[PDB]
Amino acid sequence: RKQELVTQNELLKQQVKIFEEDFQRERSDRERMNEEKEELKKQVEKLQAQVTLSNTQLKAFK
Amino acid sequence: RKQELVTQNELLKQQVKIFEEDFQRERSDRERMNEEKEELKKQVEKLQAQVTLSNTQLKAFKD
Amino acid sequence: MQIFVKTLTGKTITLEVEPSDTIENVKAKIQDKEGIPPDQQRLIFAGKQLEDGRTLSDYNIQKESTLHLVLRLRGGMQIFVKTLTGKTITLEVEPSDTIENVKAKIQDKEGIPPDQQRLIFAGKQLEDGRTLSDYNIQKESTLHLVLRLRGGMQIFVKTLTGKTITLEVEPSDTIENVKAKIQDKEGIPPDQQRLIFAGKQLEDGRTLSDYNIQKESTLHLVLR
């Protein structure tokens, strides 16, 4: 049992290669997702800002 | 080169298991990222509605 | 001129054919609308297998006629595909086949989306654009298939609790396929499920492109 073993070893090496390829793919997707989360974060930042200013205008006018 | 083959073999099987686990963890974190994005979208809608309500109140009830 | 082609199971297809066409032309139309290669289909009329090269007019074919498709158990060229597990696949291929067409045949056989497949021939990974004659893959040669952990497109589903799962999908996929994946990852029978997107709910007939379900879109699951 020495040749089935070497063929399993080459298959396993290519399997490791494709697995870390997929890992980098998912990491890239997660990076872009973090970018989109930061976009949404800045959006809620300015929304909170205008909410607080309209709140202080309301509280002052009452 | 006979025990070298089986040793490298078992090492490679372990490495594929480990890399699959790391991929699972990265997909977990991707999912949680998406959940955070969802709640941020909800916050966006709510805050825009609140801004609308207060802008209307402001320009209406007071001149 | 319209002609009918029925399978023994009951399936019908309708083809526009001119009487001058040869049986090879009709087999080409059938693979166009069917995928089945011509070296695996035999066409039958009133009991007899029509022979290639002869035209429809040699057999008195007029409009409204009915031919019968019969699949062969094999074509003229097969190769062997080995996995990391111990299973070997005898895949019927044409020599003019691209690597993507071969991966699509692998998908029809075992179900793997082709973007989750990598094929090795004597150390070289095979680009999808190339064909078998490019790599000079002859008949009965052996390839290695390694499977990915993910394709190019994934979507999110919110389960019956607020938890998120991820699905490997193709735009090609119908909502029945999506419900089957949800079953395989969650255990709800597909017709106990309702899928909601953009406030709408998705019938089990149209694909994900028909609803513009883009990558990383978030579906919601409901029990019925």
Resolution reading in Å: 2.9
Q: Is B36 on the interface with A (CB under 8 A)?
A: yes
Q: Is B21 on the interface with C (CB under 8 A)?
A: no
Question: Touching A: which chains, 3+ CB pairs < 8 A?
Answer: B, C
Torsion (CA) C47, C51, C54, C57 in degrees, nearest 10: 10
**CA gap C14, C62 in Å, rounded:** 14
What domain range includes position C185? 156-222
**CA gap C166, C149 in Å, rounded:** 12
Q: Which tokens sit at C92? A: 């019927």
| Strands of the C66-71 sheet, one edge to the other | C12-16, C2-7, C66-71, C41-45, C48-49
Measured between CB atoms, which of A7, A22, A33 is closest to C148?
A: A22
List of residues 6+ apart from C26 with CB closer than 8 A: C3, C5, C15, C17, C43, C56, C67
Distances (CA, A) of C54 to C22, C48, C220: 6, 13, 56
Measured between beta carbons, the chain B residues lying within 8 angstroms of A58 are 54, 57-58
Looking at the structure of chain B, the number of domains it has is 1
Q: Which tokens sit at B57? A: 């109140």
* Helical (H) or strand (E) element with A12: helix A3-61
- Which 8-state DSSP code applies to residue B33? H
Q: Is B38 on the interface with C (CB under 8 A)?
A: yes
List of residues 6+ apart from C113 with CB closer than 8 A: C107, C151, C168, C170
* C90 and C109 together in one domain: yes
Q: Is A19 on the interface with C (CB under 8 A)?
A: yes
What domain range includes position B32? 1-63
Distances (CA, A) of C20 to C32, C43, C138, C166: 19, 16, 35, 52
**CA gap B35, C163 in Å, rounded:** 9
Query: Cβ–Cβ of C144/A11 closer than 8 Å?
Result: yes
Residue spans of beta strands (DSSP E) within C73-191: 78-82, 88-92, 117-121, 124-125, 142-147, 154-158, 164-168
* C135 and C183 together in one domain: no
The Cα angle at residue B22 between residues B21 and B25, in degrees rounded to 5: 90
Distances (CA, A) of A36 to A31, A32, B36, C157, C194: 9, 6, 11, 19, 28
Out of C90, C119, C147, a domain closes at: C147
* C61 and C13 together in one domain: yes
Query: Cβ–Cβ of A11/C82 closer than 8 Å?
Result: yes
Looking at the structure of chain C, the number of domains it has is 3
3-state secondary structure of C214: coil
* C163 and C121 together in one domain: no
Torsion (CA) B48, B51, B53, B56 in degrees, nearest 10: -130
- What do you get for the CA distance between the two ends of chain B, in Å? 92
